[PDB]
Amino acid sequence: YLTGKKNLVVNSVIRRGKARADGGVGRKTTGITKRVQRANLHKKAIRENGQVKTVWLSANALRTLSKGPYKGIE
RNA sequence: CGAGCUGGAGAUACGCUUUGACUCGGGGAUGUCCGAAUGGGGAAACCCACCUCGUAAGAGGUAUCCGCAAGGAUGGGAACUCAGGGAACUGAAACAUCUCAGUACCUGAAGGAGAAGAAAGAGAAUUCGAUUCCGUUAGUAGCGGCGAGCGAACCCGGAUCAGCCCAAACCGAAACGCUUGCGUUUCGGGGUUGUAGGACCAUCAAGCCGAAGUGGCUGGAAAGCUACACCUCAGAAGGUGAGAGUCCUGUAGGCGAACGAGCCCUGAGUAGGUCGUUGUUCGUGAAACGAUGACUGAAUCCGCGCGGACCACCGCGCAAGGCUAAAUACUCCCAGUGACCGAUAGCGCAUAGUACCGUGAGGGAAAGGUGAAAAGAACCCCGGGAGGGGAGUGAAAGAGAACCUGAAACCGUGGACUUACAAGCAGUCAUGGCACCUUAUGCGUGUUAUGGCGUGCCUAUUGAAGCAUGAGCCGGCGACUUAGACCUGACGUGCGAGCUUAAGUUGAAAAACGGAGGCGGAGCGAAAGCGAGUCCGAAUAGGGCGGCAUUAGUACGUCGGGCUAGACUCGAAACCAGGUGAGCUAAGCAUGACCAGGUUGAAACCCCCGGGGGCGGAGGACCGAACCGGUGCCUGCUGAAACAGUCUCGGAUGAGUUGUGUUUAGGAGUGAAAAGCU
RNA sequence: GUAGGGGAGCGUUCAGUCCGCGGAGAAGCCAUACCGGAAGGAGUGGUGGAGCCGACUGAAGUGCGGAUGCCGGCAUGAGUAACGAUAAAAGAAGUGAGAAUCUUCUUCGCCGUAAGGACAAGGGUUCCUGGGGAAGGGUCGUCCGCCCAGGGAAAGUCGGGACCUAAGGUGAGGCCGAACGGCGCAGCCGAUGGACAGCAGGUCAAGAUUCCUGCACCGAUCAUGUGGAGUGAUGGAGGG
RNA sequence: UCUGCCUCAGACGUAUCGGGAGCCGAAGUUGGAAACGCGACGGUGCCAAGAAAAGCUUCUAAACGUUGAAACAUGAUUGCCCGUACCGCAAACCGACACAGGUGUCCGAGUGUCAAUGCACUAAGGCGCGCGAGAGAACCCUCGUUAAGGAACUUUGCAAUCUCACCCCGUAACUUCGGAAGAAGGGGUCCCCACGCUGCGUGGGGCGCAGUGAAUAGGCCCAGGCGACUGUUUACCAAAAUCACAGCACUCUGCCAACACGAACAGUGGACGUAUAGGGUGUGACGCCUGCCCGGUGCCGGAAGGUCAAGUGGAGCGGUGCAAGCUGCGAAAUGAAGCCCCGGUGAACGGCGGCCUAAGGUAGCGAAAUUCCUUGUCGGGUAAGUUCCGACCUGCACGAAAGGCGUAACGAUCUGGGCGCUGUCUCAACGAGGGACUCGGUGAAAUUGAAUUGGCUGUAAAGAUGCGGCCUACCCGUAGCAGGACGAAAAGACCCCGUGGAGCUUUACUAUAGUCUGGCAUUGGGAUUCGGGUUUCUAGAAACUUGGAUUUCUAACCUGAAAAAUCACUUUCGGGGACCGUGCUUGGCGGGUAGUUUGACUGGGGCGGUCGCC
RNA sequence: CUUGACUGCGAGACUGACACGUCGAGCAGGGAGGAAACUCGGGCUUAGUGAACCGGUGGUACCGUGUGGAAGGGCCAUCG
Ligand SMILES: [Ca+2]
Ligand SMILES: [Ca+2]
Ligand SMILES: [Ca+2]
Ligand SMILES: [Ca+2]
Ligand SMILES: [Mg+2]
Ligand SMILES: [Mg+2]
Ligand SMILES: [Mg+2]
Ligand SMILES: [Mg+2]
Ligand SMILES: [Mg+2]
Ligand SMILES: [Mg+2]
Ligand SMILES: [Mg+2]
Ligand SMILES: [Mg+2]
Ligand SMILES: [Mg+2]
Ligand SMILES: [Mg+2]
Ligand SMILES: [Mg+2]
Ligand SMILES: [Mg+2]
Ligand SMILES: [Mg+2]
Ligand SMILES: [Mg+2]
Ligand SMILES: [Mg+2]
Ligand SMILES: [Mg+2]
Ligand SMILES: [Mg+2]
Ligand SMILES: [Mg+2]
Ligand SMILES: [Mg+2]
Ligand SMILES: [Mg+2]
Ligand SMILES: [Mg+2]
Ligand SMILES: [Mg+2]
Ligand SMILES: [Mg+2]
Ligand SMILES: [Mg+2]
Ligand SMILES: [Mg+2]
Ligand SMILES: [Mg+2]
Ligand SMILES: [Mg+2]
Ligand SMILES: [Mg+2]
Ligand SMILES: [Mg+2]
Ligand SMILES: [Mg+2]
Ligand SMILES: [Mg+2]
Ligand SMILES: [Mg+2]
Ligand SMILES: [Mg+2]
Ligand SMILES: [Mg+2]
Ligand SMILES: [Mg+2]
Ligand SMILES: [Mg+2]
Ligand SMILES: [Mg+2]
Ligand SMILES: [Mg+2]
Ligand SMILES: [Mg+2]
Ligand SMILES: [Mg+2]
Ligand SMILES: [Mg+2]
Ligand SMILES: [Mg+2]
Ligand SMILES: [Mg+2]
Ligand SMILES: [Mg+2]
Ligand SMILES: [Mg+2]
Ligand SMILES: [Mg+2]
Ligand SMILES: [Mg+2]
Ligand SMILES: [Mg+2]
Ligand SMILES: [Mg+2]
Ligand SMILES: [Mg+2]
Ligand SMILES: [Mg+2]
Ligand SMILES: [Mg+2]
Ligand SMILES: [Mg+2]
Ligand SMILES: [Mg+2]
Ligand SMILES: [Mg+2]
Ligand SMILES: [Mg+2]
Ligand SMILES: [Mg+2]
Ligand SMILES: [Mg+2]
Ligand SMILES: [Mg+2]
Ligand SMILES: [Mg+2]
Ligand SMILES: [Mg+2]
Ligand SMILES: [Mg+2]
Ligand SMILES: [Mg+2]
Ligand SMILES: [Mg+2]
Ligand SMILES: [Mg+2]
Ligand SMILES: [Mg+2]
Ligand SMILES: [Mg+2]
Ligand SMILES: [Mg+2]
Ligand SMILES: [Mg+2]
Ligand SMILES: [Mg+2]
Ligand SMILES: [Mg+2]
Ligand SMILES: [Mg+2]
Ligand SMILES: [Mg+2]
Ligand SMILES: [Mg+2]
Ligand SMILES: [Mg+2]
Ligand SMILES: [Mg+2]
Ligand SMILES: [Mg+2]
Ligand SMILES: [Mg+2]
Ligand SMILES: [Mg+2]
Ligand SMILES: [Mg+2]
Ligand SMILES: [Mg+2]
Ligand SMILES: [Mg+2]
Ligand SMILES: [Mg+2]
Ligand SMILES: [Mg+2]
Ligand SMILES: [Mg+2]
Ligand SMILES: [Mg+2]
Ligand SMILES: [Mg+2]
Ligand SMILES: [Mg+2]
Ligand SMILES: [Mg+2]
Ligand SMILES: [Mg+2]
Ligand SMILES: [Mg+2]
Ligand SMILES: [Mg+2]
Ligand SMILES: [Mg+2]
Ligand SMILES: [Mg+2]
Ligand SMILES: [Mg+2]
Ligand SMILES: [Mg+2]
Ligand SMILES: [Mg+2]
Ligand SMILES: [Mg+2]
Ligand SMILES: [Mg+2]
Ligand SMILES: [Mg+2]
Ligand SMILES: [Mg+2]
Ligand SMILES: [Mg+2]
Ligand SMILES: [Mg+2]
Ligand SMILES: [Mg+2]
Ligand SMILES: [Mg+2]
Ligand SMILES: [Mg+2]
Ligand SMILES: [Mg+2]
Ligand SMILES: [Mg+2]
Ligand SMILES: [Mg+2]
Ligand SMILES: [Mg+2]
Ligand SMILES: [Mg+2]
Ligand SMILES: [Mg+2]
Ligand SMILES: [Mg+2]
Ligand SMILES: [Mg+2]
Ligand SMILES: [Mg+2]
Ligand SMILES: [Mg+2]
Ligand SMILES: [Mg+2]
Ligand SMILES: [Mg+2]
Ligand SMILES: [Mg+2]
Ligand SMILES: [Mg+2]
Ligand SMILES: [Mg+2]
Ligand SMILES: [Mg+2]
Ligand SMILES: [Mg+2]
Ligand SMILES: [Mg+2]
Ligand SMILES: [Mg+2]
Ligand SMILES: [Mg+2]
Ligand SMILES: [Mg+2]
Ligand SMILES: [Mg+2]
Ligand SMILES: [Mg+2]
Ligand SMILES: [Mg+2]
Ligand SMILES: [Mg+2]
Ligand SMILES: [Mg+2]
Ligand SMILES: [Mg+2]
Ligand SMILES: [Mg+2]
Ligand SMILES: [Mg+2]
Ligand SMILES: [Mg+2]
Ligand SMILES: [Mg+2]
Ligand SMILES: [Mg+2]
Ligand SMILES: [Mg+2]
Ligand SMILES: [Mg+2]
Ligand SMILES: [Mg+2]
Ligand SMILES: [Mg+2]
Ligand SMILES: [Mg+2]
Ligand SMILES: [Mg+2]
Ligand SMILES: [Mg+2]
Ligand SMILES: [Mg+2]
Ligand SMILES: [Mg+2]
Ligand SMILES: [Mg+2]
Ligand SMILES: [Mg+2]
Ligand SMILES: [Mg+2]
Ligand SMILES: [Mg+2]
Ligand SMILES: [Mg+2]
Ligand SMILES: [Mg+2]
Ligand SMILES: [Mg+2]
Ligand SMILES: [Mg+2]
Ligand SMILES: [Mg+2]
Ligand SMILES: [Mg+2]
Ligand SMILES: [Mg+2]
Ligand SMILES: [Mg+2]
Ligand SMILES: [Mg+2]
Ligand SMILES: [Mg+2]
Ligand SMILES: [Mg+2]
Ligand SMILES: [Mg+2]
Ligand SMILES: [Mg+2]
Ligand SMILES: [Mg+2]
Ligand SMILES: [Mg+2]
């Protein structure tokens, strides 16, 4: 379960294939080409302390842990 | 409760019961084995253990995850709720954006509901005041290949309404932390916000009681007819030999149990930002705001967020902490009701997820009737029986268990009139013959001979007897509907310059109330706006519009059309989702088994000088059975068989054949490769 | 007079109200020469045996010849084709209501690396005995693998388990992943393989390394005696 | 450090328990044969190199004892759970059936015949296949013989003859020296006796039309095409020239390999393999060989110049405020990969031409599995030859690893000829058995608007039993035939149509898995040169950097070895290393995948033409 | 000589299913040629052409979501 930093997980968004830089700056408006989905996550870490452990953490979670222990020391 | 009971079960034997059975209401106690299954294993319901009890027979324990511990969780639910995922046919008369639709489906969590909920809101009145649901706003504002199409909210009227506690500024700790009366997280007091607050300093149950009719008549049988009565807080209903207010059960009404269920501070890796995206009417549009995936990253009450780029002013509100009943949804289950069905209907089932089909997932029938009462036919006759004929019973056996009615197609027996030189969509009209006489002695009815005339029905078509479609026949089932405060007409009713309600409230053997809101009443314009005038325009020319013809409107109802939705019924090839299949077949893997018999004669090694002899016994070698296979012909072609048989033929120690066990699958597997097998 | 528009109506079920009818007989069914302009409606008779007509109003699952329409029944082809290997059958005797077909006897013909025998999968009482004769049997049937009832099935040593491991399947911890889930060491499951103690006979109608008779073998516990001391693992080696 | 010990397969004897033909119990001999079974785990050869675990034997660790041991002898006691009947190559399993199909293993006797599980007949055993009886017509099926002829049949000698087993003699081109080969051909085959040898051989005699006396048991040869070869394929119309194949070649791949399955920094396969290996592609034994063209496309290098995204940069232009400030855009310069551009590359996609393009066919073959005209022309074979063989070449439209020419052997391959022999034929006959016919029993099916259903000729929607005229025809059946009923079966697979479908293709459109690439994060100190920042100070440089860039470092992170196989821990420890991998984002590539598009008229559609206006 | 290759309009008719298309007297503002009457809103006439959508450029000050602006939109003219 890719849930990070005992906190948060992956999300999903459609990604849209914009056919033009035209409209809104002087042309027939932008057309459309893509209706397809994607994911998005983040990556591994180490050294949990409820007593001792090592688990997934996120980028900004490693930041928050660097600026002080936060519910679970590090 | 007050005499029966011994399940359906209908079949006897056996008993039990007025010291109260049986049945009903309410508790206990037993509770094999499987199944979350949980001592370990497992192909569910079967195998194998261990530990204390220990006299044995028997009992108790032995899964995992939460927690010191109590105590909790795991699994199961028709639909309903929320969440994580998330289609495609389809419409756009093609198709990409778009729609279908966050629909189906899958998955997770929970309950009797759920979700949501107590304003950094709505919004433009310095109005409002948690959430949800209904009406209306309104198909308005908007969105949109500005196409198809999609589509809010506020105000207002209703259903129900409840608001509540923590964090933190400060006390008092304790423990630990360091240069010496301090600050990281626990525990109490205290303290909980925007008209800013707070700190520190002055009834339902099982049940019981319950009124009133007798004589004659028809009849197999009284409840019907009749004649006289009676009760009625009770004429709702069902049973009873046919239709019962007064025969039974009941009904109105009354009572009713031990245990039984039930209302100095005010939240930071955040707010905010850039990149990707997305939600609400929000399709990158001038696109705000919320939402996170990545990287960054503030401020305190002279402060922070919003008011649809953005700025100033003016307003509304205090984010980053939690809980929260009721109005809402649904229907496995129970009760009542029905301009609902009544045996091809109604649920698939008058019961069956059965029979039956499938390896499976899964699919899936037909279903009825003696009689009031079994009195269910003793006895006799033909027959092995089956079947029948009598006798009995019964009102009826014109009800006899192939048991209400019993149509039609189809099969027969008997009778009338007819037919063995005739050419024929089968009739029709005319006349003679022969029968017959119950709407019936006639302008009859049945049937005939002979004349004239005469190309089935439907559909589809320029055109059907067509050698063009459909159909064996008869029975039954079978196709222009429904919905919505939607549009537009005809007819009819009410009220009329005015007409009317919606949601709901209260009453229901009945309907009233409810003005929120909707339609007329003013038009012209892109619009601001003017206004019987208005727009174009520098004034005179026009468009539309009122006057005059003021056609009078509105709410209902029936009807003709329209729109939207399966939209007159039946019919695809296909597309997508989640599952079931490698017990056939294509392959792999592990472990086993199999190949009569015969022919040939390789290397090596030993002799004579690469040759000859000795010997040896090699091979995707040869002939050939088993076995594996399918070459050619015939047969078979409603088969012996949904791929075979006889004859013939190929391989037959190898790239061989075969058995167990197991692995691989749907855009996928497998394939000595045909798009073949799955 | 076709598509099409318009008008007036007939019949079916259900509902409300009326008028009534019915065991001296209702609906339904059956015959029919009467009536109405049509859809239709009445009269009378036969059948039936318990409900029902007429009028007015209302609401519809409301009118069938078709759809290679559905369900069901019944026909035509027709006493037709077939009766499932060209391995033949004949006589006598018996049983019986009944016999080409069942039982017996004596011959004949057919298989004989089978068309004989013993097992495994699979089937599930098909086995034996006594009865039966509807249907099943491609005819018959006294018979049957059909129907009814009663019996039959015996293991320390055979095959499996209480022993082992292969592919494969699982799998605490562990590694991954929107969810459900996907991998995975040890260990565990898993026979198609490894290990392991009996042979000869007899015999129920129906069982046989199982029961019986004869005579063995294997493990375990105990006892008597000899011995009167070292046993010697979830680990090592050989070996299988 | 010096053959011998053990074992009994099995035989023999003695005894004993059984069995034994038979009317309770007799005999149990001599000679021969012989397993895939047993002795056994024997011997020999070979390459492709042939499970694991427990039981079992042996050692200590711990513990328990060392005057109630291990072990042995006898006696006793003990012995759980499940399967076991019957069918079991089929009437009981799978095939809807009491179905001519299918189903793994074991045993499967005798006589004859080189051998044998073959063939014939038979033992034990098991069966005569659950309608029968007659008749001896047509036709149909499976068979026997056939005069004279002998392929004249036909698409084709398809079918069916012929041949057939063992022994002897004898065998060609050609060859990869094995083979072709059972080449072809010719002879023998029984019975008796005598003689020699180990059932043979030598001789003599005998009978028959005939002696593998019946059954099983090759017809052969000449010449081509294709493929070398054994083998593999379309379960159910194709077995082949298809597929594969040994051999060859190009290219990729340094090891957490390339590549492939995968939600995945997981795990696997490659492979417990490591360049003499693995993947991909194409050719296809062997022999002689594999030519010209790099312009286009692909690929490998180059990387002076042009173009190019996010990002950095933000000069300048505007709103709105009294102002402070807030705010919408927004350049130049610098930013990757890629593409343009330049070289090379063919056993890379390809190309080797019409009376300029990059070049224009080297060998070899050629009227062909390719050749239109075409039956080309000559020759061969035939009486006669569109076929076939050989030359020729005018190759519509061969050609060198989509390989070119050859090749012995192989082939249920295809094509032409010959010998032999035949009912394939002239041209059919006679015979047999199973149906067809008849009788008794049981008794279907497709089809069917209804039928009282004729001929000619004419008309009708244009092929008439049914309409018109004329002819013919007494009623009803049974056995037969196959013209008609536009006979039956499947609402035509051809064709056209539908703004239907689906499979596949590419330089059609559009996305996208995948993959490459710049920026940011994980992500860290240091030295070094630093375009520059700030306060430092007699144009100037020390505290320092915001960074970029080689370089280097070891705490991140990855990865490896050590009693602890995956993982976790220390590691005397080892290597990589701020790269990689991963997360977001930028641009490229991306038929690997995916959703779709691909007009109409049209004397059927397509091709050609044509779509508006005068 | 000069622009009538004009702005505001359009009584009436031809023509077409629409939607487009054609001809136009006369009115105003302002011009032009003529001495005048008068004729000029393109060419002897009939071909030299594209709805809508979305956008570019110039004006106008209508809309602009609390108000005052501005972003954005509308109207007029034109381009693709
Ligand atoms: Ca007959
Ligand atoms: Ca017939
Ligand atoms: Ca002859
Ligand atoms: Ca018959
Ligand atoms: Mg979503
Ligand atoms: Mg009672
Ligand atoms: Mg009873
Ligand atoms: Mg269990
Ligand atoms: Mg359990
Ligand atoms: Mg338990
Ligand atoms: Mg589609
Ligand atoms: Mg569409
Ligand atoms: Mg789409
Ligand atoms: Mg649903
Ligand atoms: Mg669910
Ligand atoms: Mg649940
Ligand atoms: Mg309200
Ligand atoms: Mg009653
Ligand atoms: Mg009375
Ligand atoms: Mg707060
Ligand atoms: Mg944000
Ligand atoms: Mg954004
Ligand atoms: Mg758009
Ligand atoms: Mg704002
Ligand atoms: Mg926001
Ligand atoms: Mg605002
Ligand atoms: Mg009814
Ligand atoms: Mg039913
Ligand atoms: Mg019925
Ligand atoms: Mg059903
Ligand atoms: Mg089944
Ligand atoms: Mg089943
Ligand atoms: Mg009854
Ligand atoms: Mg009977
Ligand atoms: Mg009787
Ligand atoms: Mg009587
Ligand atoms: Mg009767
Ligand atoms: Mg009756
Ligand atoms: Mg009867
Ligand atoms: Mg009755
Ligand atoms: Mg009846
Ligand atoms: Mg008769
Ligand atoms: Mg008659
Ligand atoms: Mg005659
Ligand atoms: Mg006559
Ligand atoms: Mg006739
Ligand atoms: Mg007549
Ligand atoms: Mg026609
Ligand atoms: Mg006609
Ligand atoms: Mg006809
Ligand atoms: Mg017809
Ligand atoms: Mg047709
Ligand atoms: Mg037909
Ligand atoms: Mg309305
Ligand atoms: Mg509504
Ligand atoms: Mg007017
Ligand atoms: Mg109306
Ligand atoms: Mg219309
Ligand atoms: Mg629709
Ligand atoms: Mg799918
Ligand atoms: Mg299998
Ligand atoms: Mg064997
Ligand atoms: Mg052999
Ligand atoms: Mg020798
Ligand atoms: Mg061979
Ligand atoms: Mg050979
Ligand atoms: Mg076979
Ligand atoms: Mg095959
Ligand atoms: Mg051969
Ligand atoms: Mg061979
Ligand atoms: Mg694919
Ligand atoms: Mg009556
Ligand atoms: Mg009538
Ligand atoms: Mg009655
Ligand atoms: Mg209907
Ligand atoms: Mg009709
Ligand atoms: Mg019909
Ligand atoms: Mg039918
Ligand atoms: Mg047959
Ligand atoms: Mg007999
Ligand atoms: Mg007798
Ligand atoms: Mg009989
Ligand atoms: Mg017989
Ligand atoms: Mg018999
Ligand atoms: Mg006898
Ligand atoms: Mg057998
Ligand atoms: Mg069994
Ligand atoms: Mg059994
Ligand atoms: Mg039996
Ligand atoms: Mg018997
Ligand atoms: Mg019996
Ligand atoms: Mg019988
Ligand atoms: Mg019976
Ligand atoms: Mg029978
Ligand atoms: Mg024993
Ligand atoms: Mg065993
Ligand atoms: Mg095990
Ligand atoms: Mg494993
Ligand atoms: Mg697993
Ligand atoms: Mg086994
Ligand atoms: Mg044993
Ligand atoms: Mg016996
Ligand atoms: Mg037996
Ligand atoms: Mg025995
Ligand atoms: Mg002896
Ligand atoms: Mg083990
Ligand atoms: Mg047995
Ligand atoms: Mg069979
Ligand atoms: Mg077999
Ligand atoms: Mg043998
Ligand atoms: Mg033999
Ligand atoms: Mg022999
Ligand atoms: Mg044989
Ligand atoms: Mg048998
Ligand atoms: Mg004959
Ligand atoms: Mg034959
Ligand atoms: Mg002769
Ligand atoms: Mg000859
Ligand atoms: Mg000829
Ligand atoms: Mg010839
Ligand atoms: Mg041929
Ligand atoms: Mg032949
Ligand atoms: Mg030579
Ligand atoms: Mg030679
Ligand atoms: Mg040859
Ligand atoms: Mg002679
Ligand atoms: Mg001779
Ligand atoms: Mg012979
Ligand atoms: Mg040729
Ligand atoms: Mg070949
Ligand atoms: Mg085939
Ligand atoms: Mg197959
Ligand atoms: Mg074939
Ligand atoms: Mg890894
Ligand atoms: Mg690996
Ligand atoms: Mg090839
Ligand atoms: Mg070359
Ligand atoms: Mg020639
Ligand atoms: Mg030719
Ligand atoms: Mg010649
Ligand atoms: Mg010639
Ligand atoms: Mg010929
Ligand atoms: Mg030919
Ligand atoms: Mg030639
Ligand atoms: Mg070629
Ligand atoms: Mg080549
Ligand atoms: Mg070739
Ligand atoms: Mg060649
Ligand atoms: Mg072959
Ligand atoms: Mg030939
Ligand atoms: Mg010839
Ligand atoms: Mg019979
Ligand atoms: Mg039939
Ligand atoms: Mg004519
Ligand atoms: Mg004619
Ligand atoms: Mg005629
Ligand atoms: Mg006629
Ligand atoms: Mg025939
Ligand atoms: Mg068709
Ligand atoms: Mg399509
Ligand atoms: Mg990508
Ligand atoms: Mg991108
Ligand atoms: Mg495609
Ligand atoms: Mg593309
Ligand atoms: Mg066309
Ligand atoms: Mg002048
Ligand atoms: Mg004018
Ligand atoms: Mg503008
Ligand atoms: Mg404003
Ligand atoms: Mg503007």
PDB file of C-alpha atoms in Angstrom, chain A residues 9-48:
ATOM      1  CA  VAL A   9      -1.563   8.290  -1.011  1.00  0.00           C
ATOM      2  CA  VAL A  10      -1.640   8.459  -4.850  1.00  0.00           C
ATOM      3  CA  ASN A  11      -4.145  10.608  -6.760  1.00  0.00           C
ATOM      4  CA  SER A  12      -5.467  10.481 -10.312  1.00  0.00           C
ATOM      5  CA  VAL A  13      -6.270  13.098 -12.954  1.00  0.00           C
ATOM      6  CA  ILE A  14      -7.249  13.028 -16.600  1.00  0.00           C
ATOM      7  CA  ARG A  15      -4.598  14.666 -18.830  1.00  0.00           C
ATOM      8  CA  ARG A  16      -5.813  16.786 -21.744  1.00  0.00           C
ATOM      9  CA  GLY A  17      -4.040  17.170 -25.080  1.00  0.00           C
ATOM     10  CA  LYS A  18      -4.353  20.861 -25.931  1.00  0.00           C
ATOM     11  CA  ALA A  19      -4.384  21.335 -29.682  1.00  0.00           C
ATOM     12  CA  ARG A  20      -3.450  24.983 -29.883  1.00  0.00           C
ATOM     13  CA  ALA A  21      -1.885  28.048 -28.259  1.00  0.00           C
ATOM     14  CA  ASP A  22      -4.429  30.096 -30.220  1.00  0.00           C
ATOM     15  CA  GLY A  23      -7.452  31.336 -28.310  1.00  0.00           C
ATOM     16  CA  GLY A  24      -7.298  33.945 -25.592  1.00  0.00           C
ATOM     17  CA  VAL A  25      -4.342  35.620 -27.332  1.00  0.00           C
ATOM     18  CA  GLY A  26      -5.781  36.130 -30.748  1.00  0.00           C
ATOM     19  CA  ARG A  27      -7.212  33.221 -32.694  1.00  0.00           C
ATOM     20  CA  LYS A  28      -9.910  30.603 -32.962  1.00  0.00           C
ATOM     21  CA  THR A  29      -9.901  28.970 -29.571  1.00  0.00           C
ATOM     22  CA  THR A  30      -7.788  25.975 -28.510  1.00  0.00           C
ATOM     23  CA  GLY A  31      -8.951  22.555 -29.742  1.00  0.00           C
ATOM     24  CA  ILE A  32      -8.756  19.302 -27.799  1.00  0.00           C
ATOM     25  CA  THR A  33      -7.265  15.859 -28.456  1.00  0.00           C
ATOM     26  CA  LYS A  34      -6.742  13.840 -25.225  1.00  0.00           C
ATOM     27  CA  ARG A  35      -9.110  12.232 -22.729  1.00  0.00           C
ATOM     28  CA  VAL A  36      -6.804   9.828 -20.829  1.00  0.00           C
ATOM     29  CA  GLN A  37      -6.078   9.237 -17.126  1.00  0.00           C
ATOM     30  CA  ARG A  38      -2.914   9.006 -15.032  1.00  0.00           C
ATOM     31  CA  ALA A  39      -1.766   8.368 -11.438  1.00  0.00           C
ATOM     32  CA  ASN A  40       0.940  10.145  -9.272  1.00  0.00           C
ATOM     33  CA  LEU A  41       2.747   9.100  -6.033  1.00  0.00           C
ATOM     34  CA  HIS A  42       5.944   9.516  -4.032  1.00  0.00           C
ATOM     35  CA  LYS A  43       8.880   7.548  -2.802  1.00  0.00           C
ATOM     36  CA  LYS A  44      10.753   5.549  -0.144  1.00  0.00           C
ATOM     37  CA  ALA A  45      12.442   6.511   3.122  1.00  0.00           C
ATOM     38  CA  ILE A  46      13.595   5.038   6.426  1.00  0.00           C
ATOM     39  CA  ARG A  47      13.727   5.299  10.225  1.00  0.00           C
ATOM     40  CA  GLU A  48      10.307   5.626  11.839  1.00  0.00           C
TER      41      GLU A  48
END
